[PDB]
Amino acid sequence: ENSVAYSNNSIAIPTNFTISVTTEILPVSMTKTSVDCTMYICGDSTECSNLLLQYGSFCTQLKRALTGIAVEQDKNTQEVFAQVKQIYKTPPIKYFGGFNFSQILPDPSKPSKRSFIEDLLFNKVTLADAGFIKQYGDCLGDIAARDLICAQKFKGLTVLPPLLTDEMIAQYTSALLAGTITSGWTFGAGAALQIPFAMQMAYRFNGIGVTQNVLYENQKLIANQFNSAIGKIQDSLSSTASALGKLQDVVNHNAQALNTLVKQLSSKFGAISSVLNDIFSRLDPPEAEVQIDRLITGRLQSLQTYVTQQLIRAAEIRASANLAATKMSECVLGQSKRVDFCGKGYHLMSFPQSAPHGVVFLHVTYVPAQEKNFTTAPAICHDGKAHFPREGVFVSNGTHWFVTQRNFYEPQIITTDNTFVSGNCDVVIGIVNNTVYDPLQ
């Protein structure tokens, strides 16, 4: 618990401030998949074709629904990333007011232009193991234990490769980062217009209730804090191997669904066995047809349940992707005024980074600290006229009075051009006497 020393003439004001880097992760797409009908239902028998075609074209609905899901996936990814109509290249000069950018900028000295941090994430996950048939069909002679993906493919359950490959996604992320580093947020409206970085930071501070004079006089401290934060987030992410969670959750969910489906193949369904050829050959058509009917109905019902569950998960992924797109459009391409929407504390900017099945945002924000106590008052009456602040508040260390800002201690003398007047001073409840200054007298 933490009590507060509340009063009616006391006020605290921060004196110092810090920059902190926060990380958040959002999934954007699951794994697309397809399904074969005849080879799954019974496994390459003519009697199956003879007996199931009259049951209806259910696999037509299955194919159309699953194809809709598949197209929805790459629709989601192209909507969330492809929001810039050009590609922007950083100049060879890489000095930005002392703001180091080695970690997140793309690396030419590497196969594929994947930056350092996204490489770190890609090697931290290392559980997809591609699996998007990276020229599969090479597991003919399985000297090893055949793994699991090839077997799942050989039961009629295939996986299609995604429309967008990884390197082009990295190119899009690099373009976004270059645009947001070199031209402010103007490129969100029209053509990018270059602005030196320092005055862009001055603009952003001017956005959050603080005047530029605080930044231009403390640039080195900002640079040092920014670099230290970047190093700290590097170390923190490299250390913990279980900070992602959500992506692993999605992958495990899909794997569990597929595994349940493939395990369901060995159900008796209240029949002799799960074998097809033995049941057909041993029996006689009048009862063989009954047994095959029961097997077909059971397996169709199980497949329908799986299809429904996949359809359900698709909607959740869709909602998450839409929210991620909104956040990427607002926090990056602008400066949101919505508190606790692009990181804790007042927001300054954000950078995106790719991840095998999603996006990771780095939020760079503002946090005050080192507060101090003072005594206050609403207005000052001078010569029978009340006086109110222009934008700050009145404070006093006990003897003299000053106007100051609302997030950084900076006293000033009470001048007639730093305040205004309304009425006489017999109506307000907290008037305190003092003097005022007219500069021209």
């Binding site: 074969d36 020229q135 003919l140 000297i143 050989f154 295939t158 490769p161």
Partner: protein
Amino acid sequence: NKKFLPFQQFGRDIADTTDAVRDPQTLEILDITPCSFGGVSVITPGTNTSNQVAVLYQGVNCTEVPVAIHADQLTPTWRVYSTGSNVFQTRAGCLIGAEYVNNSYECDIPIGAGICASYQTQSQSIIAYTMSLGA
């Protein structure tokens, strides 16, 4: 190459799939793989414009699609594409009947692995190329 034990007779994999079996005579364990199969897709530019189509075999290297059509017994209208007149092997299987240009453009008809196909009038035909993000 994977070795058995002297009593061990035949192998099985996860999800109760038979993988390798020792021959009764030579006592050598041979590997068994399901026969070749896959899905087919039709790349079409629109009925009103042209009647030239491309075919796409999903998830397979197609050094063996002419034999696939021979065994499946489809018409010579399919055997002409089974023969390697114009074969290109992408990541998503392969496509037959589309020339692969070496320049870049925007994307209209997706296939996969960042490769698109479009109809172009130079010698009107169905070209296939690599996606380009933009200028």
